[PDB]
């Protein structure tokens, strides 16, 4: 066979994974079942680090301790649509319950008359997105180092019946050791089988989402294929100016690869970017092991990645606590808190 000895080690390794995930699910459930840890005036606001339709993320400094954090601020009056609301509750509850080396750590959450707040660990190395766009593309070993962390993170999340649903370089921060921190759980959801919301980012949507089919955690493995392609090529596989054109390309079932992609890489991506769910890697009898044991990952020491023992390909420069040099600049708008509570009943659970 392909493995000689090496097969016994891999099997024992797989059994240890099971053991780890069983303990991880016990810890998750304790926090999921039995979960206002601060207020706004406990923080100095320093700089906007990112913006979206519903609010912004700011670097803040805790007045008492002097620790720096990333504060996600959501305007309750922009979180209007039904699924926008449910998703905000998913995000908070999931983040407070998970624990994994490549997932950002939530520190505080609270709300006031106008906004919802989630205060998480600050990751000063910046978004993968901006490093990727600056250099163009990552070499295959570099992309593989990041991909391995996502594989392990999705193995963890899926074992807790959590689907992530917004994988992309914008959501992956680089920490001071050069490892990944997944940092936005706004589309994550606990799903025991299928779910039906039409949501995500166009370039990363699995075909079954676009086709309004009930779908499962395999959409994350499709998105992993998009991510690895984008990291190694510098652009994603389904690439067009308008969302409707992107959707047509995704559903077609056709992917073209750069001539510099290794044959091992193309093989992996053809099995991830597989429209047929009975054939998509991650969704088969052997689950995530079809991915972890693929030839493209032959050099990957999965345990060593988890334990953060592998030397990173890139270490971001940091000038000191609070440094924002690895982030882009954004327009700064004052945080105004209304005198009257807004949307109290719709966010009573937050």
């Amino acid at each position: 066979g392909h493995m000689g000895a090496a097969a016994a080690k891999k099997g024992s390794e797989q059994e240890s994974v099971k053991e780890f995930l069983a303990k991880a699910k016990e810890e998750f459930l304790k926090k999921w079942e039995s979960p206002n840890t601060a207020q706004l005036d406990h923080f100095d606001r320093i700089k906007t680090l990112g913006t979206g339709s519903f609010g912004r993320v700011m670097l803040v400094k805790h007045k008492e301790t002097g620790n720096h954090y990333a504060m996600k601020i959501l305007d309750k009056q922009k979180v209007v649509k039904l699924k926008q609301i449910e998703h905000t509750l998913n995000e908070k509850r999931i983040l407070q319950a998970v624990n994994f080396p490549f997932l950002v750590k939530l520190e505080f959450s609270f709300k006031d008359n106008s906004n919802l707040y989630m205060v998480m660990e600050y990751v000063p190395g910046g978004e993968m997105f901006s490093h990727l766009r600056r250099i163009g593309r990552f070499s295959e070993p570099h992309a593989r180092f990041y991909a391995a962390q996502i594989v392990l993170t999705f193995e963890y999340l899926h074992s807790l019946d959590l689907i992530y649903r917004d994988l992309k370089p914008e959501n992956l921060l680089i920490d001071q050791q050069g490892y990944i921190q997944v940092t936005d759980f706004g589309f994550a959801k606990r799903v025991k089988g299928r779910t039906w919301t039409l949501c995500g980012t166009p370039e990363y949507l699995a075909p079954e989402i676009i086709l309004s089919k009930g779908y499962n955690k395999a959409v994350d493995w499709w998105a992993l294929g998009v991510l690895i392609y984008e990291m190694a090529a510098g652009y994603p596989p389904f690439f067009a100016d308008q969302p409707i054109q992107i959707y047509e390309k995704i559903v077609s079932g056709k992917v073209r690869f750069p001539s510099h992609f290794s044959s091992d890489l193309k093989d992996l991506l053809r099995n991830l970017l597989q429209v047929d769910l009975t054939k998509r890697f991650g969704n088969l009898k052997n689950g995530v092991n079809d991915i972890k044991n693929h030839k493209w990952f032959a050099t990957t020491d999965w345990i060593a990645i988890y334990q953060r023992k592998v030397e990173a390909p890139f270490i971001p420069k940091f000038k000191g606590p609070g440094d924002t040099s690895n982030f882009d600049d954004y327009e700064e708008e004052e945080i105004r808190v209304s005198i009257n509570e807004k949307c109290g009943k719709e966010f009573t659970e937050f």
Binding site: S53, F129, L198, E203, F239, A240, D241
Partner: peptide, 13 residues
Amino acid sequence: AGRTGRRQAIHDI
């Protein structure tokens, strides 16, 4: 030709 800037997610397409 495609989108090169940051991409916004959609909560309900």
